[PDB]
Structures are given as structure tokens and as C-alpha cells.
Subunit: 31 residues, 3 copies
């Protein structure tokens, strides 16, 4: 099967990690 | 029931709020 | 029909584009 809901939950987790990386970057670069 | 699609729609809304916070931060800190 | 999973996959794609815009902004503004 294609399990698009499971794939989407995974895509959600990848985007959370990208936003967390940007939050950290801002902190680390002291903006 | 577990309603994973509803949970995922909610998770989507939390990530939109996190990205909006970063967009605002950039504006507010004048980068 | 309402196809909430398809709508959510689309919402996912809009949020990826917003995060990519912020990643690019940081690069372009040289933070």
C-alpha cells in the first residue's frame, strides 16, 4: 500500500526539524 | 479512536505558528 | 467529498515553502 497519512506524519517531522534548526540558528548567531 | 489525521492537522497548525513566530522575529529584530 | 488528507498534504507543502523562504532569507541577509 501507499500510506499517505503515515508519509505525511513523517513529512511533518522533517519540517519540525527544519524549523527547530532555524530557531537554534537564530539563538546561536545571537539575533 | 486514534484519529491520526485530525492530530496531524493540529500538528500542522503548531508548525505554522512556529514559522510565523520566526517570520515575526526577523521583522522585529530588523534583519 | 472533503479530502482532508489531500488538503493536509497541500498545507504541508505551503509550510515547507515558508520555511525555505526563511532559510534563504538568512543566507541572503548573511546572518
Amino acid at each position: 500500500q501507499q500510506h499517505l497519512l503515515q508519509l505525511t506524519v513523517w513529512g511533518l517531522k522533517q519540517i519540525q526539524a527544519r524549523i527547530l534548526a532555524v530557531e537554534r540558528y537564530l539563538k546561536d548567531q545571537q539575533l
